[PDB]
Design a binder for this molecule. Structure first.
Ligand SMILES: CC(C)(O)[C@@]1(C(=O)Nc2cccc(C(=O)N3CCC(c4cccc(CN)c4)CC3)c2)OC(C)(C)[C@@](O)(C(=O)Nc2cccc(C(=O)N3CCC(c4cccc(CN)c4)CC3)c2)O1
Ligand SMILES: CC(C)(O)[C@@]1(C(=O)Nc2cccc(C(=O)N3CCC(c4cccc(CN)c4)CC3)c2)OC(C)(C)[C@@](O)(C(=O)Nc2cccc(C(=O)N3CCC(c4cccc(CN)c4)CC3)c2)O1
Ligand SMILES: [Cl-]
Ligand SMILES: [Cl-]
Lengths: 243, 243, 243, 243
């Protein structure tokens, strides 16, 4: 997370950390808990190639990475079948836990939006995670969960920005309809934040609008962050995840 | 180039090296001289973001990079306007030299195929360059130009191989129709060979079939190298380059 | 620490971590609290070149680096004046805290030996720190304090081992008389343990025998770790530190 | 070499490159030819630990590293028996070739000084090699041999400079009598230049005064380069190398 600050303990009870086996169980992506047995993340974190399940774990909300880990094994990885790269789109995946978790005030699921929600500019939206704090800069120990308020920008405005300083033809769409754009040069998600949730308050309820997917660098001029638009993928998600 | 060897000095008289200005004029990409004033290369070498022409030069065939440099400036870069990333396609660009090259036996143009030209499966083609000799292993000094023989493979077969050990649905196309596959787990192009030519000898003549574009690593199982198909872009090429 | 394990929270109440200012207060060296206002460490951690005191702090015993930091400033660095490199010797320094530490059971001073104290060969001593767990392998998050039991070895034997597989003439001393050796190919201190304490329990009391100083790598054959011998520097220590 | 420029082909016919086996025969140190079967270098290039002979080769004068290598195997490495680190001193070693080389105008030996020569300030001295061109900056391809004129400074002046900004006591000698100092903030040898020759013209004859040994960084304020003083080691050298 670039900009913003350390998140309070009481906030974002759905944030998860995905971990890959190595010298230690290292954080490589974010995720959100959307049901006690299911985590929603980005496909590019875990695909498109099939990886070994035993080498992946999940860690539910922690204020500080690594310090009191209790890692959770994963029984299935389901990746959107249209997924190949983040720029093509469909950058969405689900992890099913081997056991359901116990919800509580500090750990519980985020609500998905109804299909009709478009999340227009000036909706209040936050993004969270343990990723880099600027291009090339790692989050320092002790690795606090960070959060930042990001302005949503309409898709046609963001597509046109991505064409400024580019060779790509104006009628060749870079930002697609399954995508959502947010952030500016002071406030963006970054590497290590991928797979995490963009959430917006709507009628006093938190809704996950987006999944951190890609961008051109972090907080660069004319390059807002691009998120996978969850409304677009609800049917796919409900093929696997109960209501 | 993976699994190849050093080229004879008489061969590949069309091969070029693109150089970016820093502490030295460093090779980043290959290209092919297709007309006295024109170089064919991959769009991803020089886009999609617009770059400064002063920071770019071209070097014609050299047995060993850096030794006997005579660097040529570029008057124009033309990136295909449908290009945004290699995996979406239109990974093709033209550089216009500021001056015609005086052609000779050591330095001359390669022939573009006719629109009708089908390079049948199994046909022996060759790819050349100064790229990595394996995954994350740089070409050692003195940077000899390497060459390797790679069989062409039908798109259908190549697409299907990219689906093996992947989550992408089998109906969802990875290798697109403006692309061509060639290579295997012993013989491939690699990073720094990008933009370089895939050439086949057809009816005793050398034709350029491909431009090194991308792949999943170099020489991995079921992940042949992927080339921009030059026949697909002949009319765009000839819109700028004299016939 | 190579070949060791995580220390119990009750143990090593004198261990300290020195921190240098950058994007975070990063651990670079260990030390030992020998008096309420004084830390013993290795000169090579803070010299021979003069450094800025504002850029330096001290952290008292912590189970996991970075988590619960309460960083203490330093009023003075005193590097032994005969020090230039570790292999020549006098690798010993004092830091004077700006304030006395309020001592407790969790945080208290270690005892310096008497001048007469010979730590006989084979005696079991312990070394502690947050350094590398092998050659060029960092301590993984969450950075637990490690401990390891290392037998003391006579200088004559240690010197002779350093001569094996070396060109240095056998009459030319490598391990000097202000130094002490301990450790073997399974059990050693490593980079980032520097300045930390080698302690032995003698007649039921913990005495500091050594300061982690240098070695040829960590846990290599015939290259035991080398420590500054604290008895050699007692009078220099007591010239500054209250008895 | 920091400062100065590319050496002319006709100059420094005694310069050698030492090479270590890896992905390619990589340059790690300089040397000088002092007899057709003997090369003089620094001990820290090849010691103090015994290395495998088969993994070391020598390359006689080349204008450009790597381009026309003809590597020469080594039958013995003789390191000064007092050697342990460069700061202690005796940083001098000899390599005996398996065959004698053929001398010529482009390749021949350098003359050693008579024991009486002290090389006082304002002697004209040059140092040469293929090392870094500033702190942390590699010599760029094509790797030309560089040379730089360096001012000699008297030993007591250089020792006092090395004490400025240091904790080391004024009467503790850093620069020793077997050492020689040369260079300033514009003109110095650097990493990769070690083992190479400092030569000075005296009565129209080139004499090797020094062997590039160590320094505090390269071209840093108050830290001239330190060379092993060859006059001091003539007897040792003549135990092995004929007149
Ligand atoms: C891996 C890389 C470098 O290729 C990258 C990529 O990172 N590109 C890219 C595209 C767009 C933006 C950004 C970017 O700047 N960042 C940094 C910030 C990141 C970010 C992260 C989170 C949030 C936000 C929002 N602020 C941003 C996103 C990535 C980066 O490029 C792509 C855009 C094409 C891509 O997404 C991607 O899909 N890469 C990819 C796809 C498929 C394969 C490979 C792959 O394995 N390759 C590439 C091809 C190589 C190769 C080269 C020549 C010849 C051959 C012959 N076989 C092979 C071998 C290695 C790589 O990844
Ligand atoms: C390797 C290093 C970093 O320790 C270095 C060193 O480089 N120091 C040094 C000292 C003085 C100047 C410079 C310097 O700035 N440079 C860069 C420029 C170079 C240069 C090169 C050519 C020409 C010129 C002239 N312009 C300069 C010279 C080195 C550097 O430090 C020394 C001065 C002590 C030394 O010369 C040296 O002898 N090093 C050394 C000696 C013996 C062993 C080891 C060694 O293997 N170590 C160090 C100790 C480590 C360790 C740490 C804690 C605990 C344990 C427990 N067993 C082990 C393990 C790894 C290292 O090398
Ligand atoms: Cl086909
Ligand atoms: Cl002893």
């Amino acid at each position: 997370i670039v900009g913003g600050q350390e998140a309070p303990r009481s906030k974002w009870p759905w944030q998860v950390s995905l971990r890959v086996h190595g010298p230690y169980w290292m954080h490589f992506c974010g995720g959100s808990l959307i049901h006690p047995q299911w985590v929603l993340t980005a496909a590019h974190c875990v695909g498109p190639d099939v990886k070994d399940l035993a080498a992946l774990r999940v860690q539910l909300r922690e204020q500080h990475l690594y310090y009191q880990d209790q890692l959770l094994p994963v029984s299935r990885i389901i990746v959107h079948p249209q997924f190949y790269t983040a720029q093509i789109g469909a950058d969405i995946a689900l992890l099913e836990l081997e056991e359901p978790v116990k919800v509580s005030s500090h750990v519980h699921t985020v609500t998905l939006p109804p299909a009709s929600e478009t999340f227009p500019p000036g909706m209040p939206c936050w993004v969270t995670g343990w990723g880099d704090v600027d291009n090339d800069e790692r989050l320092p120990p002790p690795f606090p969960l960070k959060q930042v308020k990001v302005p949503i920008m309409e898709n046609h405005i963001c597509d046109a920005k991505y064409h400024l300083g580019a060779y790509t033809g104006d009628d060749v769409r870079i930002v697609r309809d399954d995508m959502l754009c947010a952030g500016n040069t002071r406030r963006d998600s970054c590497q290590g934040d991928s797979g995490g949730p963009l959430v917006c308050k709507v009628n006093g309820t938190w809704l996950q609008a987006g999944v951190v997917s890609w961008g051109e660098g972090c907080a660069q001029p004319n390059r807002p962050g691009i998120y996978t638009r969850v409304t677009y993928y609800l049917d796919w998600i409900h093929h696997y995840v109960p209501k």
